Amino acid sequence: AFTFAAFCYMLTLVLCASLIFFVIWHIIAFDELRTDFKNPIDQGNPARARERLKNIERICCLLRKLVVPEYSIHGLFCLMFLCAAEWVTLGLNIPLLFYHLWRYFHRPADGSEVMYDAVSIMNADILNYCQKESWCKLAFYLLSFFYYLYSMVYTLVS
Amino acid sequence: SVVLFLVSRFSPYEESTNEFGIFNSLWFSLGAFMRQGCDISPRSLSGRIVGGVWWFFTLIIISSYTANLAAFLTVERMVSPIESAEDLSKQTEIAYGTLDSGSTKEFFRRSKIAVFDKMWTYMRSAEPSVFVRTTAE
């Protein structure tokens, strides 16, 4: 029957669509970045160079503004599953929590002022790592969404 | 609060996110729950949907709280913690003992039912002496 855990699952199901949207936006932005990078980077025209630089900066700013909501909402999921005493889901979700914590609080870039830095961005290694991370995160969020739906239905019917 | 924040950030009225950040979203929701007012109300259909359902929820919940409290204060109901003997064996807060050197203790001692075996175990492993020397005691 309806209970606290089922409501938690419903709310997480509603909020995981937002994470899916965020990761889809991430991959679209990184596809645009790849289209700019793999495409010739000649900057002979000052106007063209300025436009490309401002596009890169805008995309980086968008990604930076959009990261904290994802991590904090996933932390909300973890907190909810802790309070509801749903141990399995909390165990499945802790590793991503710690990965996000590490990612946000390490700043492997030597600059260590922004997660994504326009100057450090456009690097093939960093670009490809971000692309792969985003794709894996999208897969994880889809799987977790379907798992949450199944658990919600299971808890309701019983 | 989170949904209002998202809906107002990435689908703003068009500015519309300096109002209805996370902090001000929490504040708006809290002021709604407590039947107070608001220094800001959403202008977009999505934020307004969120606010409307939150308002309905708040109304129902406050009404239910007041009504059930009126019930509680109108009708006194004292529930006995115990309505059987198994309830008494499971409980450890309540202590129980018979009259020492009597037929009741002899009954519990030689018992074969599980519940009374558990009671006998407790009474034999009880500190201080649950047992008694007289009925009036």
Binding site: - | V3, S11, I49, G52, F56, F57
Partner: peptide, 27 residues
């Protein structure tokens, strides 16, 4: 009802996002 309204609000926000993006790209 609350969960349904939250989901509907997300959906309507997505619709508004697409609509506004198209109208702005027109501009």
């Amino acid at each position: 009802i609350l969960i349904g309204g939250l989901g509907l609000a997300m959906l309507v926000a997505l619709i508004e996002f697409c609509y506004k993006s198209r109208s702005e790209s027109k501009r």
